Amino acid sequence: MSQLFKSFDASEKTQLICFPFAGGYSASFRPLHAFLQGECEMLAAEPPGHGTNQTSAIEDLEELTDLYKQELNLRPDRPFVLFGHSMGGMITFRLAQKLEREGIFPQAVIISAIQPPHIQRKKVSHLPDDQFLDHIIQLGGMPAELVENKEVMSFFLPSFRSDYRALEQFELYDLAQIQSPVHVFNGLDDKKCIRDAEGWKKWAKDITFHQFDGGHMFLLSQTEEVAERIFAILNQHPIIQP
Template identity: 35%
Template sequence: MTVRAAETTTSAWIRRFHPAPAAAARLVCFPHAGGAASFYFPVSRALSPDVEVLALQYPGRQDRRTEPCVEDLGTLADLITRELGTWCDKPLALFGHSMGATLAFEVARRLERDGVRPCALFASGRRAPSIHRDDRVHLSSDAELLAGMVRLGGTSAQLLEDPELVGAVLPATRADYKALETYRYAPGPALHCPLTVLTGDADDQVNLDEAAAWAEHSEGEFDLEVFPGGHFYLAAQAAAVIAAVRGRLATEVPGLAR
């Protein structure tokens, strides 16, 4: 992988809400299924200027809504890994929630394969990649898919009463679920970077055993952080989650204060 100093401009893939050229490290944030880069705007604001947040924008949503969605998680990981080659001139950490956690893991594997070791991987709200459930949400009807989004807590029921908004978010959400649910973990070398797993104690998408199973996927230091709440626990627990992220990064990155 070619590593060069990052430019101030962003690509279609990356949103740099609070540019911080002097930051000690960068944190790449991977959205959940149906999610967008804007989900991580508060994280960027909270960590800047010590840590520069790069929030990923997948195709098929918001300002990329005219682009075809990527329905294969491995392909998406390949595209993102290639994009991040520009940003590896300083310590790079990865944070993903739900689908984003599995995707961040696959990107971390590719980065390490290419000689770039992330300084930390944060996997939130997702069971270990090696644990498979036979989920088929992407085959649901539109009404079932929308009801599931509301039930998980990441989307307001009131917003989904807007037909225009539904038409904008539904295709990307379905494509993301297809990418996640057709993903199959391919055995390979464990990561070497520190791995922090974060989960809600009432999340029916991942139980504590499934969260703890992430430990087998890295030879680096492993931490499991459990917070009150369901699948989108991190909305109500934002301050505590950000503190956990900052604390781990401060351990790994010289000069970064807690």
């Protein structure tokens, strides 16, 4: 009972975007994937029109490899990028992510969105308050203790070493000096310095890394200048304007 457009060819690269938007990440990734990649599966979520067959439910992956390779199933697409909104959808994501990890462990391209304010309880020498807010998982007031799991798996928390080692359990004490695959960070409207600190700490930058933050923090909202400022420079990060 839902609409969902999709168009894959030779299983190049899966691109899931439910009601996306140009903004800046789109104009930045556009040329990034258009210059580094090409002929990639293009799909997106559409509004309800008329009962045709069934509801999307983010099942185009199999629905495609099956409705096309019905004759014989070999293997789905390795890469997969899912773009969501700043609202929240642990459900839709739960199916997508689960479908990915279950579809193929060794993935190349992968984008995480809806990055919640909460952070995997850990200890870092980033700031004297980092650990505080890390265990507080509030950043504006957000009561949740029995969802930290469904969030790290669905919401896709920012904490890389956490989720990573939580889904691979192979992470080492050293993660610096790493680059090859493709990935991008989306959301982090609340905290942005968290990813910049915990991100640069490893000095690792995949062949294609991007950062798209909004700004809804307690102070971020107060100073609209800083907000719009970051957004602009963010869209010009990869390509500066004349």
